[PDB]
Amino acid sequence: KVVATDAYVTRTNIFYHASSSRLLAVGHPYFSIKRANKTVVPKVSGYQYRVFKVVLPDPNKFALPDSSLFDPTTQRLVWACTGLEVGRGQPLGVGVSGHPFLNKYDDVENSGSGGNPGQDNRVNVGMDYKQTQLCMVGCAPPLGEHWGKGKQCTNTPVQAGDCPPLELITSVIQDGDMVDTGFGAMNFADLQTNKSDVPIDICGTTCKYPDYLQMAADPYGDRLFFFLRKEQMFARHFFNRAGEVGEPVPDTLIIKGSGNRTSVGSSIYVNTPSGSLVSSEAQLFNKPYWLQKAQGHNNGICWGNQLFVTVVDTTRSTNMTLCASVTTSSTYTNSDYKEYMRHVEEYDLQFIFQLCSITLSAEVVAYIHTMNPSVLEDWNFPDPYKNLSFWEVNLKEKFSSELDQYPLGRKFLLQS
Amino acid sequence: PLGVGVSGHPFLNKYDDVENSGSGGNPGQDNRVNVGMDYKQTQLCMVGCAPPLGEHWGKGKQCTNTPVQAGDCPPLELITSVIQDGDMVDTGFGAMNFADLQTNKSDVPIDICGTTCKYPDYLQMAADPYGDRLFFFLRKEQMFARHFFNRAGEVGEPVPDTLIIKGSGNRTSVGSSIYV
Amino acid sequence: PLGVGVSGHPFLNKYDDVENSGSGGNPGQDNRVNVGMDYKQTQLCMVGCAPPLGEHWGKGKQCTNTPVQAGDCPPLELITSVIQDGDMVD
Amino acid sequence: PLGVGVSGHPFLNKYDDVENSGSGGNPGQDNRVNVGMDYKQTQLCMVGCAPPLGEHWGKGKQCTNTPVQAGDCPPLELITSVIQDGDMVD
Amino acid sequence: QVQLVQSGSEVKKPGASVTVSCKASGYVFTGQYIHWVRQAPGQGLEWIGWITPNTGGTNYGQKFEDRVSMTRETSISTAYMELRSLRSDDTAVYYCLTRRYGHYDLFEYWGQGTLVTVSS
Amino acid sequence: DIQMTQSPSTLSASVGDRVTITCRASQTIYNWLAWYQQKPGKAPNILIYKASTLQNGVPARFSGGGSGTEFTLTISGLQPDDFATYYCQQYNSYPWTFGQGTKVEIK
């Protein structure tokens, strides 16, 4: 029913280079400030899904150097991705997170022994998240999972704020989506009501993880080409949350009684993860990548002149601290100064592409129509993607066949 | 012989050690304490026939529109500057000009307060048409965090109200949202 | 996502930490406090046509001869049983 | 068997630990504290027909020109001698 | 044993400043919350404020947030509290006191108290 | 500020009697309460906390209870050393507040 793409497509001996030049993202690492609903400084963090929608030149109307090979009848031209390059330029740095109002009341390890200060309140606490190093390339945007509060419970329950059902919501991973965490990839804006169980960056958003199961389980494999993953975490401190337990522990396991007791502690225990050491040797970027054979039936074919590259990197997530003076004084005064958190994130996207052709037969037309008809009216023989927000890059009028003028071209001519 | 470099600062706005627990209190006029600190471990060699450059963050042009302000966030801009002898390597605090943008002269060790650390830009060693600035480069850099603390002083960009619930006694004066 | 879980006990026999210093010797009435932890890092796959048998140390048969006891040490036995779902990792 | 060499000092200039906090910056008459210590771990073998050289930082000659000083900084110099038995490791 | 020792009783003129110190020993001084309260003859207990040696983080009551300034030092681990604009009604005994919230415990310690008398 | 009223302000009783002292809170406190007794010239100490929990080293004749704003303390059997001034303090919110006090003295 479904056949590999290389059975019908044809690879030519034509290679072009594209470069995104300098890409910069500067903004506050925790929340997007806006004065009179005008976001001057948006959300910019090293803990952010970077989804780049690359638009491509039409190979059919492009100034092809050898138009003799091309035939307007029964032959169309598409771009095929060959090599990729993600140019990080910022130095190494671990991001810092936290929240001033969090439920950090007992230190179970008893080195600190916080002892749950009196009355229901909060306290300031901060930590770092895990080392996450992920990159994805594809002709379709990635799909990732997260659990959340979906449909209500079975039958007709009567309750007031009990445990909701858990549903595996699978959503397209767009720019503005929050990375996985050691606290679980939930919809904390809705599922969590305190807005105080996690640091400020993830309390009002929806963390989600790429569900590789459905990702690879696609019949056509349009949603992936190849994935690179490195993850590192280890729990550095153990603690509990306050509040009451709606699912109490049975008495059959715990013996209670006597003074200084008969009130059980919280059965809710979580941790603070840490990434430990970063290194340049463990880096997966600033190095050429070659697409020998994709796992799915899509050997780098960019249908519809659209490309999707998503990266998350924590090695370049260092948080910048700024200070300024309102006034000045003879002595050091706390009132004269204002403090700001600014984050930067630098990107280069460098690509080498190979020209691809196709011969139109009746079964070929039927297959290419069944898998996607939108491209079929594109070649002219309501995209839902306009609603979602991505980081768009335009690589039109930037393709160059003079690949020897670029370092990626040199590395490409090094091997074949 | 191999040896770890050490720096520090006697009067730094080390507000509160925050990791295991926090102590949110009203700050005084001065709360600076002596703090010792090491840097990220870095090995780097660059060679060529042209002097290598480096990126560093700084204050760019004046603020856009026609603004009147006293202590706002300045326009933060990348400046490409050629590396000379005497410059300091980037540490974990970011490749930027502390002498201009860090007003206290007190938020970092003294070795990097009045100076500027800048990290070399491999991207302009690559994207240059000739590559005269670089023949071949070696780097090996390792780093990991050991403590967490907040910063004293006012927060010029306060936290949004819809994300944080506050009330009752000991509050309506927010804690330090700056975390380093 | 790759993540580590936390267990613990609200009332565990955590008398005193002994790592660098120790408190007074004899306990009081009840010194049994809130403490949590995480377990060892495990990865294991077994594959076959017949289900695996695994062992644990348990109170086997009573002591030899005819001893009279009151909370004495029970004998140790390497008891073998088939691993079914619901059992939990060492 | 492998084992770490541990040294120390019953009276060492350990004024204030500065790893997470700082005390008052004005010391006393003698703030000199018992504290232990370990050094780096080092394995080295060297072979030759002639005894190897070791250098060490030390005081050079007298200061330049003719200055007047009392407990000032002496001029440092890399003095190189032969490694002999009875020399401390680095 | 955790020992907390306050300063001796003092008599001062109105409008002046007083300084009350109390040295603590026998525990990790930095990680605890020390508190100031005062007891007037014929009236109940009331709370002045609280500080911890970490950060010197102060917090004052709504009543006495203006006339007081209070700090700590870690050299011999002593907390100082000074009062300005001595009103004649402030003649009272003053107590510094610390508390550790445990998992299931509360470790309570008080000073011996210091009498402060103000008159013309 | 959170206020409270202790009733009765003054009570007289003989040895071995059962006596109940109450206090009313201005706002809700739940169980964040403790009780103090002060002997003349001496610093008071904790006897009851958690609104129901005895402190260690203290005899079990001393009992506490209550919820919301209504809180009670009971002595089943008086002893001569127990005759002192009694207060209830919430540690709910800052500022900390104490009652007017309750003095007990032998009949």
- Residues β-bridged to residue A145: A170, A209
B160 and chain A in contact, CB less than 8 A: yes
**Dihedral sign from CA coordinates of B173, B177, C2, C3:** negative
Are F and A neighbours with ≥3 CB pairs closer than 8 A?
Answer: yes
Q: Cα(C67)–Cα(C75) distance, rounded to whole angstroms?
A: 12
A103 closest CA partner among A308, A242, A292: A242
Backbone φ and ψ of A55, nearest 5°: -95, 145
- The DSSP code sequence of D6-56 is EEEEEEE------SS----S---S---EEEEEE----------SSPPEEEE
A197 closest CA partner among A90, A77, A267, A105: A105
Distance from CA of F103 to the nearest CA of A (A): 27
Question: Is E56 close to B26, i.e. CB distance below 8 A?
Answer: no
| Cβ–Cβ < 8 Å for A41, A27 | yes
E49 closest CA partner among E40, E41, E31, E61: E61
| Cβ–Cβ < 8 Å for F48, F62 | yes
| Cβ–Cβ < 8 Å for B143, A277 | yes
Q: Cα(E116)–Cα(E98) distance, rounded to whole angstroms?
A: 21
Of E44, E62, E106, the CB nearest to F95: E62
Q: Cα(F97)–Cα(F93) distance, rounded to whole angstroms?
A: 9
A340 closest CA partner among A328, A326, A360, A355: A326
- Residue type, position A142, single letter: P
Chain F residues in contact with chain A using a Cβ-Cβ cutoff of 8 Å = 30, 32, 50, 53-54, 56, 60, 91-93
Q: Cα(A101)–Cα(C69) distance, rounded to whole angstroms?
A: 56
Residue A173: partners with Cβ closer than 8 Å, 6 or more residues away: A49, A51, A141, A142, A143, A144, A208, A210, A310
Residue B26: partners with Cβ closer than 8 Å, 6 or more residues away: B173, E57, E58, E59, E60
Closest chain D residue to the Cα of B37, Cα to Cα: D19
Q: Where are the alpha helices (DSSP H) in A174-239?
A: 200-203, 212-216
- What DSSP character marks residue A176? T
A46 conformational bin, left if phi > 0, alpha if psi -120 to 50, beta if neither: alpha
Question: Is E59 close to B170, i.e. CB distance below 8 A?
Answer: yes
**Residues, chain E:** 120
Residue C86: partners with Cβ closer than 8 Å, 6 or more residues away: none
Question: B169: which chain F residues are within 8 Å (Cβ-Cβ)?
Answer: 93-95
| Cβ–Cβ < 8 Å for E108, E97 | yes
Question: A118: which chain E residues are within 8 Å (Cβ-Cβ)?
Answer: 101
Of B33, B147, B149, the CB nearest to D22: B33
Q: Cα(A186)–Cα(A270) distance, rounded to whole angstroms?
A: 15
| Residue A233 Cα to chain centre, angstroms | 18
- What DSSP character marks residue A151? S
**Whose structure tokens read 């990107």?**
A347
- Residues β-bridged to residue F72: F22, F65
Closest chain B residue to the Cα of A120, Cα to Cα: B168
Distance from CA of A244 to the nearest CA of F (A): 13
Task: Provide the b/e sequence for A25-52 (b: ≥16 CB within 10 Å).
Answer: bbbbbbbebeeeeeeebebbbbbbbbbb
Element (DSSP H or E) covering residue A10: strand A9-19
**Whose structure tokens read 């306060």?**
B158
Q: Cα(A154)–Cα(A165) distance, rounded to whole angstroms?
A: 9
D64 and chain E in contact, CB less than 8 A: no
Three-class HEC string of chain B: CCCCCCEEEEEECEEEECCCCCCCCECCCCCCEEEEECCCEEEEEECCCCCCEEEEEEECCCCCCCCCCCCCCCCEEEEEEECCCCCECCCCCCCEEHHHHCCCCCCCCHHHCCCEECECCHHHHHCCCCCCCCCCEEEEEEECCCCCEEECCEECCCCCCCCCCCCCCCCCCCCCCCEC
Q: Which two tokens stand for residue A192?
A: 């969590």
B76 conformational bin, left if phi > 0, alpha if psi -120 to 50, beta if neither: beta
| Cβ–Cβ < 8 Å for D38, D3 | no
- What DSSP character marks residue F61? T
**Residue B96 burial (10 A CB sphere; 0-12, 13-18, 19+):** buried
Question: F46: which chain E residues are within 8 Å (Cβ-Cβ)?
Answer: 106, 108
Q: Which two tokens stand for residue A219?
A: 């019949």
| Residue D63 Cα to chain centre, angstroms | 22
**Whose structure tokens read 């490694």?**
D83
Distance from CA of E43 to the nearest CA of F (A): 7
Distance from CA of F55 to the nearest CA of B (A): 26
What method did the depositors use to determine the structure? cryo-EM
Whether residue F95 has a cis bond before it, omega within 30° of 0: yes
Q: Cα(B148)–Cα(A340) distance, rounded to whole angstroms?
A: 17
**Interface A-E: count of C-beta contacts within 8 A:** 20
Which pairing describes strands A278-279 and B137-143: parallel, antiparallel, or unpaired?
antiparallel
Q: Cα(A106)–Cα(A349) distance, rounded to whole angstroms?
A: 47
Which pairing describes strands A234-240 and A226-232: parallel, antiparallel, or unpaired?
unpaired
E30 and chain D in contact, CB less than 8 A: yes
Task: Provide the b/e sequence for F76-100 (b: ≥16 CB within 10 Å).
Answer: eebeeebbbbbbbbbbbbbbbbbbe
Distance from CA of B109 to the nearest CA of F (A): 37
Residue A345: helix, strand or coil by DSSP?
A: strand
Residue E96: helix, strand or coil by DSSP?
A: strand
**Dihedral sign from CA coordinates of A94, A95, A99, A102:** negative
Distances from the Cα of E24 to the Cαs of E8, E21, E28, E39, F45, in angstroms?
15, 10, 10, 21, 18
Backbone φ and ψ of A387, nearest 5°: -75, -40
Q: Find chains touching chain D: ≥3 CB pairs under 8 Å.
A: B, E
Q: Which two tokens stand for residue E69?
A: 């300034």
If one counts every other C-beta atom within 10 angstroms of the C-beta of residue C86, the result is 5
Chain F residues in contact with chain E using a Cβ-Cβ cutoff of 8 Å = 1, 34, 36, 43-46, 49, 55-56, 87, 89, 94-101
Of C3, C17, C34, the CB nearest to A108: C34
Q: Cα(E22)–Cα(B50) distance, rounded to whole angstroms?
A: 66
Question: Is C38 close to A238, i.e. CB distance below 8 A?
Answer: yes
State this model's resolution in angstroms. 4.3
Q: Which two tokens stand for residue A133?
A: 């190093």
Question: Is E75 close to D23, i.e. CB distance below 8 A?
Answer: yes
Chain E residues in contact with chain F using a Cβ-Cβ cutoff of 8 Å = 35, 37, 44-47, 50, 59, 61-63, 95, 97, 105-106, 108, 110-113
Question: B170: which chain E residues are within 8 Å (Cβ-Cβ)?
Answer: 59
Whether residue F8 has a cis bond before it, omega within 30° of 0: yes
Question: Is B18 close to A126, i.e. CB distance below 8 A?
Answer: yes
Q: Cα(D2)–Cα(C89) distance, rounded to whole angstroms?
A: 34
Which pairing describes strands B154-155 and A337-347: parallel, antiparallel, or unpaired?
parallel
Are D and C neighbours with ≥3 CB pairs closer than 8 A?
Answer: no
Distance from CA of F33 to the nearest CA of B (A): 16
| Cβ–Cβ < 8 Å for A42, A27 | yes
Task: Provide the b/e sequence for C39-74 (b: ≥16 CB within 10 Å).
Answer: eeeeeeeeeeeeeeeeeeeeeeeeeeeeeeeeeeee
Residue B4: partners with Cβ closer than 8 Å, 6 or more residues away: B38
Which pairing describes strands F70-76 and F53-54: parallel, antiparallel, or unpaired?
unpaired
| Cβ–Cβ < 8 Å for A337, B116 | no
Distance from CA of E88 to the nearest CA of D (A): 35
Residue A251: partners with Cβ closer than 8 Å, 6 or more residues away: none
Angle made by CA atoms D85, D86, D89, in degrees to the nearest 5: 95
C44 closest CA partner among C11, C13, C12, C87: C87
- Residues β-bridged to residue A202: none
| Cβ–Cβ < 8 Å for B148, A126 | yes
A321 closest CA partner among A345, A346, A342, A336: A342
Question: Is F96 close to E110, i.e. CB distance below 8 A?
Answer: no
- Residue type, position F95, single letter: P
Q: Which of C13, C23, C33, C35 to probe the E interface (max E CBs under 10 A)?
A: C33
**Whose structure tokens read 């947030």?**
E65
Of A119, A259, A260, the CB nearest to F32: A119
Q: Cα(A52)–Cα(A141) distance, rounded to whole angstroms?
A: 9
Residue C15: helix, strand or coil by DSSP?
A: coil
Of A118, A119, A259, the CB nearest to F53: A259
Question: Is E104 close to A114, i.e. CB distance below 8 A?
Answer: no
| Cβ–Cβ < 8 Å for B57, A320 | yes
Q: Cα(B151)–Cα(B147) distance, rounded to whole angstroms?
A: 13
Residue A251: helix, strand or coil by DSSP?
A: coil
- Residue type, position D60, single letter: G
A111 closest CA partner among C41, E21, B20: B20
**Residues, chain D:** 90
| Cβ–Cβ < 8 Å for A92, A315 | yes
Are F and D neighbours with ≥3 CB pairs closer than 8 A?
Answer: no
Q: Which of B17, B19, B31, B33 to probe the D interface (max D CBs under 10 A)?
A: B33
Question: A118: which chain F residues are within 8 Å (Cβ-Cβ)?
Answer: 32, 91-92
Distance from CA of E28 to the nearest CA of C (A): 14
| Residue F74 Cα to chain centre, angstroms | 9
In A314-381, beta strands by DSSP E: 320-325, 337-347, 349-359
Residue A171: helix, strand or coil by DSSP?
A: strand
Residue C5: helix, strand or coil by DSSP?
A: coil
- Residue type, position B116, single letter: T
Closest chain E residue to the Cα of C30, Cα to Cα: E104
**Dihedral sign from CA coordinates of D73, D78, D82, D86:** positive
Question: Is E44 close to F99, i.e. CB distance below 8 A?
Answer: yes
Cβ within 8 Å of A, B 87-146: 90, 92-96, 101-104, 106-107, 119, 121-123, 126-127, 129, 131, 139-145
- Residue type, position D26, single letter: N
**Dihedral sign from CA coordinates of A129, A134, A138, A142:** negative
Q: Find chains touching chain A: ≥3 CB pairs under 8 Å.
A: B, C, E, F
If one counts every other C-beta atom within 10 angstroms of the C-beta of residue E118, the result is 20
| Cβ–Cβ < 8 Å for D57, D77 | yes
Cβ within 8 Å of B, D 49-88: none
Angle made by CA atoms A98, A104, A109, in degrees to the nearest 5: 115
| Cβ–Cβ < 8 Å for A138, A212 | no
Sheet holding A75-86, edge to edge: A9-19, A349-359, A75-86, A289-290
Q: Find chains touching chain B: ≥3 CB pairs under 8 Å.
A: A, D, E, F
Chain F residues in contact with chain B using a Cβ-Cβ cutoff of 8 Å = 93-95
The number of C-alpha atoms within 13 Å of E115 and in the hemisphere containing its C-beta is 6
Distances from the Cα of D61 to the Cαs of D77, D79, D82, in angstroms?
9, 11, 20
Q: Cα(C39)–Cα(C41) distance, rounded to whole angstroms?
A: 7
Q: Cα(E80)–Cα(A377) distance, rounded to whole angstroms?
A: 82
Distance from CA of A199 to the nearest CA of F (A): 24
Q: Cα(B77)–Cα(B95) distance, rounded to whole angstroms?
A: 12
Q: Cα(A272)–Cα(B60) distance, rounded to whole angstroms?
A: 38
